[PDB]
Design a protein around this ligand. Structure first.
Ligand SMILES: CC(C)NC(=O)N1CCN(C(=O)c2cccs2)CC1
Length: 121
């Protein structure tokens, strides 16, 4: 399965699944400062799933590793901003992260395998 470009549609489909998950609700759009005026004192690099989808659709990811780094930043931002490990929105982040990691593993493996095959000779 050595298609170097296949990751992009596989990532589009995974983002559609994440948007169908009720657990993605807090993460579908950039955090609103009006609600959380201290957010940028704690979070240097806001990230959300709509920004990830737009970056992919613009052709501004070169690899699924770059997309994975931005999705992981959504989850690390949540873990940093939560006052409790027993918070609703944080607990939503942890279930969504497990779902994402379970599905991205094959996308990353197939891509890196395809690139190694491209450089075989
Ligand atoms: C788009 C809108 C719905 N997002 C938003 O306002 N969020 C979600 C992300 N966020 C958090 O991760 C936490 C909040 C409290 C514990 S963590 C801050 C609040």
């Amino acid at each position: 399965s050595y298609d170097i470009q296949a990751w992009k549609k596989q990532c589009e489909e995974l983002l559609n699944l994440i948007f169908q998950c009720e657990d993605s609700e807090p993460f579908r759009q950039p955090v609103d400062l009006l609600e959380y005026p201290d957010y940028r004192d704690i979070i240097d690099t806001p990230m959300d799933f709509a920004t990830v989808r737009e970056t992919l659709e613009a052709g501004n990811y070169e690899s699924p590793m770059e997309l994975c780094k931005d999705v992981r930043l959504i989850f690390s931002n949540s873990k940093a901003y939560t006052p409790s490990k027993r918070s609703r929105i944080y607990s939503m982040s942890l279930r969504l992260s497990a779902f994402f990691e379970e599905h991205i593993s094959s996308v990353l493996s197939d891509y890196k395998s395809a690139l190694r095959f491209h450089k075989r000779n």
